[PDB]
Design a protein around this ligand. Sequence first.
Ligand code: HEM
Ligand code: HEM
Ligand SMILES: Oc1c(Br)cc(Br)cc1Br
Lengths: 137, 137
Amino acid sequence: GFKQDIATIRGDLRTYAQDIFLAFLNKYPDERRYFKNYVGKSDQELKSMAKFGDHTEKVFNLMMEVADRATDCVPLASDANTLVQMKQHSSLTTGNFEKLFVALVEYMRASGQSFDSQSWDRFGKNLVSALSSAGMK
Amino acid sequence: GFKQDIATIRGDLRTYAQDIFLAFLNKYPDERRYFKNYVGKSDQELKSMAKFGDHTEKVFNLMMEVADRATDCVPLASDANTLVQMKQHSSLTTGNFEKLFVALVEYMRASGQSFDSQSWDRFGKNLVSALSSAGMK
Ligand code: HEM
Ligand code: HEM
Ligand SMILES: Oc1c(Br)cc(Br)cc1Br
């Protein structure tokens, strides 16, 4: 289930973080514009960049902590607030987060490996609700 | 489901309230001691007391609002904090709440009226967790 998924992802954080982030950018290519260092770079080019692996790991590590801090896929309001008041997120809307999760759920459903995909969708929905309540437009 | 069950209970609140609370006191009689003048009385004697219906109803009014304020059966932290800080709950530990929800779930399952008894199970456990987090022993 959802708790095992956190362990699956944590077990191979760098690989899952990179694969899921790329799946997001592939499904929603216009989202790349937010990451200026990644424009015009193939996947193998992106992996040769220290910041790409290091960013994507720090992103998914945080997501996993928020996921682990949740009860029945409802995140802490404090965690949503962290994400809203992060300076790297100043220009974002809840729509950006919706997109990331749609891509994450799609990736899970297409992977061999078992994931509790319904639960990640639900977590995504609850997190979007929380981001809105914490002031993200 | 859970959300509809809230409406069901609200639709016949005093009846459901007294009956569920009676189910609680009959399953766990030693519990009448937190209350005044409950001991030594049959169900019908209790239901004719001046206060019994009024106080049981008020408990359930608030229980339903806490259930309504929840997301996926996870109550609000501030709702838990209210229940912990109520002077009239000063003698309580989370176990008292545990016994109340065990009886409540047992009641729903035995009833003719369809309830999502397992969601109430979940909600009870999550409320206990929240009371602990709020500082209840
Ligand atoms: C729950 C989902 C998300 C989590 C947990 C998260 C976490 C983070 C963290 C921790 C950083 C700082 C990492 C660092 O500087 O080393 C970050 C940076 C950033 N994030 Fe978010 N993020 C999330 C969603 C998003 C979304 C939806 C977008 C936009 C589509 C976004 C855009 C950025 C950008 C552009 C940066 C700066 C790039 C960089 O770190 O070099 N993130 N993310
Ligand atoms: C989530 C479940 C509960 C809710 C929403 C709740 C809510 C309330 C409310 C709103 C009152 C004020 C009633 C009034 O003054 O008329 C109250 C009083 C009280 N509650 Fe709680 N309660 C809950 C669980 C419990 C449990 C499990 C116990 C003990 C086993 C308990 C013991 C008391 C006592 C002793 C009083 C005052 C004496 C009395 O009203 O007869 N309650 N409750
Ligand atoms: O910050 C994130 C981005 Br941008 C995309 C995906 Br998918 C997950 C996270 Br966390």
